[PDB]
From Swiss-Prot, chain B:
It comes from Oryctolagus cuniculus (Rabbit). Component of the large ribosomal subunit. The ribosome is a large ribonucleoprotein complex responsible for the synthesis of proteins in the cell. The modification Phosphoserine is found at S67. This is Large ribosomal subunit protein uL15. Hydroxylated on His-38 by MINA. Residues 1-29 have a biased composition (Basic residues). Keywords: Acetylation, Cytoplasm, Hydroxylation, Phosphoprotein, Ribonucleoprotein, Ribosomal protein. The keyword Ribonucleoprotein applies. GO terms for cellular component: cytosolic large ribosomal subunit. Residues 1-36 are annotated as: Disordered. The modification N6-acetyllysine is found at K46, K54, K109. The gene is RPL27A.
Curated annotation (Swiss-Prot), chain C:
Belongs to the universal ribosomal protein uL4 family. It comes from Oryctolagus cuniculus (Rabbit). This is Large ribosomal subunit protein uL4. Component of the large ribosomal subunit. The ribosome is a large ribonucleoprotein complex responsible for the synthesis of proteins in the cell. Component of the large ribosomal subunit. May bind IPO9 with low affinity. Interacts with RBM3. The chain holds residues 2 to 52 of 413 of the full protein. The lineage of its organism: Eukaryota, Metazoa, Chordata, Craniata, Vertebrata.
Amino acid sequence: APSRNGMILKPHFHKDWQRRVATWFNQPARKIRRRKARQARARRIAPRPASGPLRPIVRCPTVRYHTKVRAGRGFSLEELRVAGIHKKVARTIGISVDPRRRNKSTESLQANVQRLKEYRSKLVLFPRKPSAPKKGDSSAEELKLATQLTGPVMPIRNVFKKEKARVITEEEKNFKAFASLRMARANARLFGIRAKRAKEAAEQDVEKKK
Amino acid sequence: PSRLRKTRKLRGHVSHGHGRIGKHRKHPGGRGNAGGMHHHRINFDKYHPGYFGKVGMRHYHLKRNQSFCPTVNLDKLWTLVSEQTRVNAAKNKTGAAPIIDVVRSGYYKVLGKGKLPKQPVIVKAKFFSRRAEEKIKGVGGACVLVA
Amino acid sequence: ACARPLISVYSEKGESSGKNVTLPAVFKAPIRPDIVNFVHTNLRKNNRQPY
RNA sequence: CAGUAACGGCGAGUGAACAGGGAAGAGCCCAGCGCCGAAUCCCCGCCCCGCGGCGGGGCGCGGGACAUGUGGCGUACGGAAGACCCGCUCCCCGGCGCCGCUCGUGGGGGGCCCAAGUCCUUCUGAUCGAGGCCCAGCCCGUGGACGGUGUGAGGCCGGUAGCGGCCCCCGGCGCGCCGGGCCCGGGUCUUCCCGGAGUCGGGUUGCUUGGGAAUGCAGCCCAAAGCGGGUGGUAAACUCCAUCUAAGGCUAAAUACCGGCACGAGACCGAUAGUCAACAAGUACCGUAAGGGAAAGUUGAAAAGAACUUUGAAGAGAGAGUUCAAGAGGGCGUGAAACCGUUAAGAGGUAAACGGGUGGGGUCCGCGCAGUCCGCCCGGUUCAACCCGGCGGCGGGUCCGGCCGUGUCGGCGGGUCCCCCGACCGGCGACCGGCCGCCGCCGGGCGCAUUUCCACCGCGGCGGUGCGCCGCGACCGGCUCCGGGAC
RNA sequence: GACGUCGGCUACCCACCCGACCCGUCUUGAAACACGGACCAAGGAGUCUAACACGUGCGCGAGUCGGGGGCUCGCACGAAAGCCGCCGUGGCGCAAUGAAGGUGAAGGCCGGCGCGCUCGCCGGCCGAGGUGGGAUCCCGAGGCCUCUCCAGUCCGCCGAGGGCGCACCACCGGCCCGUCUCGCCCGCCGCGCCGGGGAGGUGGAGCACGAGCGCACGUGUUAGGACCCGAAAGAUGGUGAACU
RNA sequence: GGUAAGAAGCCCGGCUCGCUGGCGUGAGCCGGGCGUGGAAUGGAGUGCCUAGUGGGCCACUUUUGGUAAGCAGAACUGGCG
RNA sequence: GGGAGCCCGCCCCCGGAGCCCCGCGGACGCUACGCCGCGACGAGUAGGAGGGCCGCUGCGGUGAGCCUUGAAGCCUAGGGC
Ligand SMILES: [Mg+2]
Ligand SMILES: [Mg+2]
Ligand SMILES: [Mg+2]
Ligand SMILES: [Mg+2]
Ligand SMILES: [Mg+2]
Ligand SMILES: [Mg+2]
Ligand SMILES: [Mg+2]
Ligand SMILES: [Mg+2]
Ligand SMILES: [Mg+2]
Ligand SMILES: [Mg+2]
Ligand SMILES: [Mg+2]
Ligand SMILES: [Mg+2]
Ligand SMILES: [Mg+2]
Ligand SMILES: [Mg+2]
Ligand SMILES: [Mg+2]
Ligand SMILES: [Mg+2]
Ligand SMILES: [Mg+2]
Ligand SMILES: [Mg+2]
């Protein structure tokens, strides 16, 4: 029963909710088990990074963000072809590869190719056998480091470019942002109807000819 | 703490603070929001006007990302940049007019609320309002549209 | 910035040596028994098993 | 995201998905299309190895399956074959043994072990109690958890801590050998090839969903195509765009775990509680059956569980004995109330019982063989007074000197964080070294009109009181009256 | 007055005078010929989670936060505690108004350019308006005096009177969004069924120099078993013709 | 049963008006001058949460129905509750 | 500070004026969540609020706490608050 201006509330407790109550007393044990598994997996691959394969540079959809850069699932086949790495070979050296990712922009392609080249530059390819075959690094850069790479490999940072103070001219001052936005919205709304009217006028002229 | 609660002071009292004429029954008026139209209508109509009825158009698949457009007023615009940038203004005898990017700070729309200090600025934003643009032009700045 | 004196360190057998350490500013922080009691009472419940 | 978009006698109510941040992260295989002499697979015989999760090789015109299609290449991320640009040739399976004992800091399982008081008195039935023992005490301590032992034990015992030890089994990672299988690339160009049908889809009806001219699943009917098909959250036509390739299949990790095996813990309950079940509990018992389902822990440190004498047929007693205690005697620790017997006292014709006020009798309590209660001031053996030395402390300012320390000014000397001297000021309890005055203690003097303890005759001055029963006087405050005079 | 005498308000028993009907509950009304009640012991009924609203305390503050995750211990005390380019993905708040397409919070003064046209355009100045009541603060004549008359800087109390005026209240103005009426002009990449501006009413959970965030405590309303005990019912799955 | 018994009141001077008007009104803005406004008693104003209640009864007086009622039903005030 | 009054000077400090005020330091009184002085008031069902050195159980600290020379529990015509 309501009483002198309370909120109208609709709790979702009409089912047998007490049957399916999920407690969280397992949380510290779960965290400890996850940490132990992570440490064991890191120890299993002694020189390889604990984080895993390198991830590409990805920009987010959904204009809400539209500007953040995060790690992708894997490098596209076009990026591998430009960088010169076989798709089947790449997964064996620690490079994430997925075949679903398209490539629309040149900037992202070039950034990912540069990232792949930078990763290849700082890569220590151990020989398959104690004897050193082709493409294996020298023994000098093998005893120098054999430890894990803590954290993500080449961490992704959303970097912005600082703009120097300008010398603003009269052309920028005369620009009307609000009017331009309103005109652009009106043009976008009326493009199709104006095209229809122009077509109708053209048909009127053609029927006047005959 | 049940020690500090009212139930400790009600020991020895027959009705336990719920009256002896009208007892504490299960649900004298009904469960939940029952009776919004009958026998509870006065409360709903004098505390929640517009509860009953339907108004407006439906939007089946609504996505909040499309309608995402944070707004910032001109009252607090120099706060997005470091204080030394504002200190390096009305100075250097050149009219530097430092550029302020609101999309970097997480804003798309610039509104005209507040008073803008007399210093030229370069403001880059997804959208601008008429009053904000008027204030910026009057101060001596320029509005730049960024996609 | 309250007045922080110098505290003399002591060796393994007493007999304070020549080394001195200025009092850290933490020891000049305000004493709030109510805040300490509140924090202690609320934090001591976190190591409690359900029954 | 989000109690949101949406659904709902648009009422009650119901109610997702995308993106974002994380945990984990692993990709692949067929049919078809085509090229290789079926190049493929199963079974039975013999030989060699090992055979306790029956495999590998060889020898068999020994059988069978398979052309109504096995195997090799190859699957949407394109593929196959030639052309000729580039650098070159180790992965897996089954055994034979071998060194490193492989993180809870020696991987898993099991077994045997590793420090120090029963020290001196003293309680007790029995100490693990109490006092003391080269420093909280005697020794160890990387061991001061726990349990048992006649109480309450770090050192009596088992254990506890330890990158402590030894003895067996198992698991896993690596080395040399044997049997083997394996002649296995990348980029460009050229020529061909490239798709799962009663399926999609449409109508329908029923169920379901937030999905609303129908989200998904369906019985029935219709029923395809290949620049095709599906999707783009309002039904339809036209028109461009964006995104996948359905109707074939496999795959660990982050996830769940009121059953099972073996462990750890608790601000949980403590025998009408906690599981029904602390115990011969799903037992006794009830119902034809499906099923229903209890109550019930405690002697004592140790049975040392009462020998023996006596009355009684015996159950039962009286003695005796054990034990610290049977005033613990086999449903025996402590033993309340309701209720009952007896003993002692009181009382009793308006049922008993109750509140206020007294009286009488008992129970013990506190005195007392007067209780006249003390505590200060006054009268009737050494040191204070006063000096010398030592020790410690207090306060002060010329800030006497330095450190310490707050704000500004100076040297920019190293936005915020540090160095040097000088000046002013707050000199702020942030410290000293000297000076002054004072206080206390110790050691020397100071021998007795001062000084200090004990006991008395003074009730002399002050304060709180009297062992109990009392009485009297004066003063004040508030009342009830009485006798006079005068207007 | 002191070896069978003292004091013991309360409790042990008895007697006397006055008062005095059995408790709990429904009820206008109970001692009721209204209901429950032989007696005693033990157990026994407003709890917990979640969502709100207000009040209170604490920390930070136009910011606040720890959800989840990660790094330190092999868990005695610990499933604690400490930390994070995770310090903020994200929530809440900082902006509201329309069904929506969308729009979106400051004006005033001074001089000039169009005819100051209560309208448009150029430069400078002040930067949340004004009125009334307003706790407190500022100035303050003068008085009170002081061992005698005068002069007199100072330490005071009162101080008529005059002001700046917190918070808050009431009113008059101003601004933002939707809508109605009357209208005059501005701009262009595309001169259009383009876009923008004014005045006067009205509708809004708004602005008008901010106050929230997190934790904890209490109260009140709910969903849950919901303070405890209580039905006549309904549904699902099984067992019985040893009576009849 | 409503009002009035003064400071939120009066008396002057000047501005504004797309209202109304022959001049005028009427309203709103600023400046200045005048204080115990009948008796007696009270310190007031304002904002949030908020339980219980929502079966009543009796009496003086007025009063409706009924022959009347310890009957049923109203008004003021006071009580029991 | 000067001029003077019904011959000049002093007219002094509490480590002492000794007090009904001592502005020089200040309780026997100061658990300032403490103490002290004035006045008025005291009904209560439903209900609300405050204080409990009222009572029970367990946890973190603290009583160099109590205890086999006797803990809890139980009984009591004993002494009290
Ligand atoms: Mg990760
Ligand atoms: Mg929300
Ligand atoms: Mg084939
Ligand atoms: Mg023991
Ligand atoms: Mg022990
Ligand atoms: Mg031992
Ligand atoms: Mg549509
Ligand atoms: Mg039981
Ligand atoms: Mg017994
Ligand atoms: Mg009833
Ligand atoms: Mg009745
Ligand atoms: Mg009664
Ligand atoms: Mg009965
Ligand atoms: Mg009880
Ligand atoms: Mg409420
Ligand atoms: Mg029931
Ligand atoms: Mg029914
Ligand atoms: Mg009543």
